[PDB]
Symmetry: D2
Subunit: 247 residues, 4 copies
């Protein structure tokens, strides 16, 4: 019903897949949405596509300086952020024996410390504008499953959940909620181009319902968590995977 009218949400890694699917929904919810991504072109293509409520600002979540610039510009245009959706991440396919310290470090830096960098700045910004924000970080259900071929990723995602829980309590007093969502396999654009695409049949088997997971499936849940209906929920993780795992 355009419940999010008047609100400003930021989505990272929003140039495609789930991030984009989310930005699109929040916009449909009436919010003005900052489509952020490391891919400046994709970001602004996506915002053009979303259209009007959507504004593109490129940023590398793992770089402190571009994240500062990200938020500065948001403050200017909107006076601050009401909703933060930590979506940007690297989704690797790496056999255990290919897991380098180098690989490890990159995945951790983006998927994990990158989300702190942004959350640090974003919550500071809500706090400064006296807004009762919502933080929502996209994790993964690989954390519950111990999925193979992506150890650094599962660690980092474990990290994001840890972070989420501590943050919830850390920010409760500022009326800011912090939650996480664990998507199962989703037919984003990242997966379609990923060895991971080959796993749909096997994960479908393990699911209680039997479609292929779709970005809108996660977007529609983020939309709820960003809404007032989810006001009494903080520190929780929503698992969205057609019953792959039970949480």
């Amino acid at each position: 019903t355009e419940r999010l009218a008047g609100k400003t949400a930021l989505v990272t890694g929003a140039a495609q897949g789930i991030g984009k699917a989310i930005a699109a929904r929040l916009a449909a919810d009436g919010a003005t949405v900052i489509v952020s991504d490391i891919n400046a072109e994709g970001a602004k293509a996506a915002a053009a596509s979303i259209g009007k409520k959507a504004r593109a600002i490129a940023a590398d979540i793992s770089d402190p300086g571009s994240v500062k610039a990200l938020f500065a510009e948001i403050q200017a245009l909107t006076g601050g952020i009401d909703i933060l959706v930590n979506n940007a991440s690297i989704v690797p396919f790496v056999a255990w024996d290919d897991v380098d310290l180098d690989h490890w470090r990159k995945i951790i830096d983006v998927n994990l410390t990158g989300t702190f960098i942004v959350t640090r700045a974003g919550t500071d910004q809500m706090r400064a504008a006296g807004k009762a924000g919502r933080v929502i970080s996209i994790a993964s259900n690989t954390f519950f499953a111990g999925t193979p071929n992506m150890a650094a990723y599962v660690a980092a995602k474990g990290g994001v959940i840890g972070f989420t829980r501590a943050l919830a309590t850390e920010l409760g007093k500022y009326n800011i909620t912090a939650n996480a969502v664990t998507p199962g396999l989703i037919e984003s654009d990242g997966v379609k181009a990923s060895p991971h695409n080959e796993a749909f049949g096997f994960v479908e088997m393990l699911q209680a319902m039997k479609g292929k997971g779709q970005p809108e499936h996660i977007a529609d849940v983020v939309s709820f968590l960003a809404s007032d209906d989810a006001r009494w929920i903080t520190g929780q993780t929503l698992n969205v995977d057609a019953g792959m795992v039970r949480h």
Copy 2:
């Protein structure tokens, strides 16, 4: 925007507290709602209060015969149920040493086997009408916490989550989701009559946010789970307690 228009939802223990708060919200969602309760007067007082969307049918969830009659009548009026909200339960305050086999049996019979009796009939009804239903059972976050003075209740609630998970996979093939919600302390008409009321200050301390939990807090989340936004969620438990526990 009345997304639940055309749908029929049944809420048990709906004469007051959370059940009523839920029936009220689902009606606001546009659904026609069967307000069911063991307290026939309260049920029908509550449906009068709700509106023309609400209809009262009294039933003891722990009695097979009254649950049969509950559903028969629903089939007649509506051709079947789309949404099931297992809310009816007994919320005891019993010191461990007062936990009788007798007390144990009563709590288990209603809070647990009573929810099976209804779910059995309700999902059969959806199934028979070829409706892609939603089951939502109200558990409790005492299951995560191991809360004292209510051991039978915590077992039964553990049971409802167990049930929920198995059911999810059991019904996935008929396009029926089954989920659960674990409310923390809520200032219901029930609680207000309980010694439990005295615990608000302590639980508020442990919460990340600092209000007293309110029935509308849980109703608003049930409303989401009943909606299409939650279509990719089955077998999961939503914990709603202002950050009391982290799930």
Copy 3:
């Protein structure tokens, strides 16, 4: 090193499979072990097999009167119980549509309320003898997985975990711990004689390690929980399934 010398442990459903495997181990730990079972012959065959550390006493965990008689006799012989292992349960294979109220009730009564009946009496007995006991209840990892063809069972097992958590806090002040173990598929006698036996190849696939689960695998863990090494652990659930699920 016979750490359990001087201690008295009771194992229910101990005539075969895991219960027997456990009684055997606890006896090897030096404990005198009451082998209890509904099958009087099996129980006492098993105790004969185990040695002179083992004594057989038949009992139906779901019957309050035979449970009373069970413990009275134990008090006489040993002056009370130090360790309680709730093992006795019914392991069904029932398609959802065969799940009767009748089936439901039977499974709940034994697997769940039966374990309360015994735990009530057992912990009272420890308490009365001023013993700092250990309660250990065998659940199942189907509770984490939402395994199909056994809905009543998954609910009851959910219940036992609920019970366990509440009990931990309930008895902490009497220096009594209460824990639970969730075995995955185990090649016990009942499994071998049950449509469940056919699932070994599939569950082996999902396991991180690739043997068939063996009763000694669970017995060896119970032995630990019954020991002083596990003294700071209460309210927890040990999941033992070669990595089927991650808990």
Copy 4:
């Protein structure tokens, strides 16, 4: 009865507190133990104290080069490692608003990526020697609780559990188990010197049992996980906190 005789175990951060308590116990189990720590003097003081089964080798878990040197020397002396206990970590007390990118990075680097660096090398070493190893990583129950004043730490520890789960499946085929333990508040030498010490009375309240947590409490559990009794357990987290949280 010295079950760990013949085995070689490495413990990091083993100069004091839990690490030392663990090294001591594993040695008592008969294992030859590498007492590793960033504090070379503490490490070798601790091994002198422990005994002749204990050997000290200093190393910074967060530095790849010293970790290489750590394991090379172990290979020389023992032909490789059978058991790995990731204990070394930084236990901070930082108010949210003091959480720097700089602070964040340090905690993540040691507590999380430092445990990868060691696990990478250690498991490679077991693998190379054809040994069916055990990995045990000490996390924290703050991950379940969302404890405040230590957000970077709670994230990292979340990460260690993530890592653990993925690793379990990653190494199951080489007969190597990987588990984690979540200690609650423990009265170690670090904690005694931390503003965390002041929290004992509060955490004691929330505990089901009411002592102050002791390093031996965790050591005795690690000992079990290192033993054959825990051979069917991989990808699991043992929570040891006197019932603070229920896992």
